[PDB]
């Protein structure tokens, strides 16, 4: 069936905005429409990714785990393609399609850890060079971004048309909250990180939260968003901050500084700044913090090295971002940026085309800019 993969991999993904998800769910909510969209969109997105996994170095492609992921995706793809010529006019089709979505999602439950074992297996068993490293990085950002997106799509359909007349979050629209109170998600993410830090370190910093709604001064800050995505990013930044703070001060007399959260709202951005006095990170190391599996924890709260890049995928997924700035010797600021406007919050999706191909078949190039010798001439004669 590889011709079907070639073809769908050449189709462009159709990025959707939070507005569209919300307008579809609220005002429309036509099961037929969703079905016409998804039966085509899912295979496109899947094929775009598969095409990329096929470009990985053969020694990674060879790991049992990468094979498993491939077959899972292939099985899903084939299962969705059965619907390309089935009429939405028959209710049975609609119903089985729903079951199929549930099925593919369950099958895709293991995917994140299976691919991780994949590349871990590889990194530790085969020697590792930086050409191939930035490539795995590039692949993983894209591969996991699509996973977020399939799950987003499948969740909307099942939550909407699953017919579950007992919904966990009644006033929502699928998994979108039209009035997500940001400080409440901050407090929840914090309490749940605290618990974990307190369990192992026997202590945890206090949270202080502050708000400034430039849009409308005294008003609590709300945004249209997927709460679980916001929760995830915050949770992950808070665990990092708590670890950093607690480790720095366990041998001090000063007592633990708080973790400060500033939430702001402007014409375009909702910004959330998490600040700690946890000692910071030298500039040289800031980029690699975002490498999958870069960790300074015993290989505690930390270990995997997924928290920071995955959180940044959630931020970039809807046109936001996650950036980090440290003052080495004092502490760090971690800032989540979201779009204030749902009309501006479009999915940002990996496209397979020549540009992507090129990333996988790049080759080391000379540096643009100079580098010094590792043993420079002693200018003292």
């Amino acid at each position: 069936v590889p011709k079907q993969i070639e073809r769908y991999s050449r189709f462009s993904p159709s990025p959707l905005s939070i507005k569209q998800f919300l307008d579809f769910g609220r005002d429309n909510a036509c099961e037929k429409t969703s079905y016409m969209f998804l039966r085509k969109e899912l295979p496109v997105r899947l094929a775009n990714t598969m095409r990329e996994v096929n470009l990985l170095p053969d020694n990674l492609l060879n790991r049992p785990s990468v094979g498993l992921v491939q077959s899972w995706y292939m099985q899903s793809f084939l299962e969705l393609l059965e619907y390309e010529n089935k009429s939405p006019e028959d209710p049975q089709v609609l119903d089985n399609f729903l079951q199929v979505l549930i099925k593919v999602r369950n099958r895709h439950n293991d995917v994140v850890p299976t691919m991780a074992q994949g590349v871990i297996e590889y990194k530790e068993k085969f020697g590792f060079d930086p050409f191939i490293s930035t490539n795995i990085q590039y692949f993983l950002d894209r591969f996991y971004t699509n996973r977020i997106s399939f799950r987003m799509l499948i969740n909307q359909h099942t939550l909407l048309f699953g017919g579950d007349t007992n919904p966990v979050h009644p006033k929502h629209i699928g998994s979108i909250d039209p009035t997500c109170n940001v400080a409440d998600v901050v407090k929840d993410a914090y309490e749940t990180a605290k618990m974990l830090c307190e369990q192992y370190y026997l202590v945890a910093p206090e949270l202080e939260v502050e708000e400034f709604n430039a849009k409308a001064p005294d008003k609590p800050i709300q945004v249209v968003y997927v709460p679980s995505h916001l929760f995830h990013m915050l949770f992950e930044l808070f665990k990092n901050s708590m670890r950093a703070t607690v480790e720095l001060y366990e041998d001090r007399k000063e007592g633990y500084p708080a973790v400060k959260t500033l939430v702001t709202l402007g014409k375009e951005d909702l910004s959330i700044k998490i600040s700690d006095l946890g000692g910071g990170v030298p500039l040289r190391k800031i980029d690699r913090l975002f490498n999958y599996m870069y960790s300074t924890a015993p290989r505690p709260l930390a270990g995997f090295g997924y928290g920071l890049p995955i959180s940044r995928l959630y931020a970039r997924y809807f046109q936001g971002d996650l950036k980090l700035y440290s003052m080495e010797g004092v502490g760090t600021d971690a800032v989540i940026y979201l779009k204030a406007l749902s009309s501006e919050s479009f999915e940002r999706l990996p496209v397979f085309n020549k540009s992507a191909w090129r990333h996988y078949k790049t080759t080391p190039e000379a540096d643009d800019w100079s580098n010094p010798s590792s043993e420079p001439r002693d200018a003292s004669k």
Partner: protein, 97 residues
């Protein structure tokens, strides 16, 4: 007649695309083209797609100008030739083997 040439037709660049706006040209009449170069931004209802050259040659003539909305599937958008001497022959508008 005209020398060996290929017409680039507008494909279905998305499973449901039926037309597209030629938003921008990324190559100029007379420029070289390799397999995979960016040829044009095609805008639809659903995305702004980067349309890639599928066959290496030279851009001889643009049939559909920038800005043309609603171009149907299969419209010749432009002409490709195998050698750059063959361009001038298209100013006023089976050996491709």
């Amino acid at each position: 007649s005209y020398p060996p040439h290929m017409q680039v037709l507008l494909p279905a660049l998305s499973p449901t695309m039926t037309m597209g706006t030629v938003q921008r040209w990324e190559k100029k009449v007379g420029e070289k083209l390799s397999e995979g170069d960016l040829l044009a931004e095609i805008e639809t209802d659903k995305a702004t797609i980067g349309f890639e050259v599928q066959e290496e040659g030279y851009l001889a003539k643009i049939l559909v100008p920038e800005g043309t909305r609603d171009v149907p599937l299969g419209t010749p958008l432009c002409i490709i030739v195998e050698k750059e001497a063959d361009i001038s022959a298209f100013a006023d508008y089976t050996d491709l083997k």
